[PDB]
Write a protein that binds this ligand. Sequence first.
Ligand SMILES: *C[C@H]1CCc2ccc(OC)cc2C1=O
Ligand SMILES: [Co+2]
Ligand SMILES: [Co+2]
Ligand SMILES: [Co+2]
Ligand code: NA
Length: 262
Amino acid sequence: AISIKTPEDIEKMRVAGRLAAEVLEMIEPYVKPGVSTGELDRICNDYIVNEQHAVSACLGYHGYPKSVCISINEVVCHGIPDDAKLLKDGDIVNIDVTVIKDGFHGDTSKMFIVGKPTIMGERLCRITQESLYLALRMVKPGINLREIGAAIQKFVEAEGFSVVREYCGHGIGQGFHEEPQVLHYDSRETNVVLKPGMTFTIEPMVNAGKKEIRTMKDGWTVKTKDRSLSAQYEHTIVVTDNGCEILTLRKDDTIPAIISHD
Ligand SMILES: *C[C@H]1CCc2ccc(OC)cc2C1=O
Ligand SMILES: [Co+2]
Ligand SMILES: [Co+2]
Ligand SMILES: [Co+2]
Ligand code: NA
């Protein structure tokens, strides 16, 4: 079943979600042409462990060897930090962080555009963030997840892009990936009504081309089948009595942390 978090659990998820957001805030000035993805991962890991006094949920998870996932251009998700892989002008890069603090998880990702942006990279990243935000604005008690996944898909396809169908958002708490699955597209299979105290992620992945993806031979890296660009943003939220509260908000977000309906 889906766990309802207690008020004390929610306070612990505020703290873990803030730490995760803070990793994304911190790492920004380091993202520039010529830096390696391995070095970015080391900086993040060292900050989580030594500064935040927390740990990466990603390190060792099902054997994963690094602390964050770093996904460039046509890599959709789960890109593996590599000391040999250097960023360059125009690259779009997702950094996905999940921190554990006091046994609670905070999970968030954002795109960075490296150096001189390309038109396509700027547009894809903006539409992706807007897809997340439109979903965030819908969350409240009594709505069905289906409606949220439908709204993301409608908006994205109207902008000429496609929604990746795997790798959905998820419940989160003391576990990293809990129920429910949070699909970012319309499915007749989806039927989950929200209630206050649920905690879950929304994390749409949007491809500039077609939706299909492929897992590479390293067993982790996922790429677009068509080699088009792919972008993603993620937040962790808690459902409140009248809306939701974003637990991984950053200073650069332009949506309020607390979304109230009435
Ligand atoms: C932490 C990061 C490692 C890579 C990976 C692969 C598959 C998966 O499925 C839920 C999650 C992850 C990660 O979260
Ligand atoms: Co300290
Ligand atoms: Co997630
Ligand atoms: Co994540
Ligand atoms: Na990408």
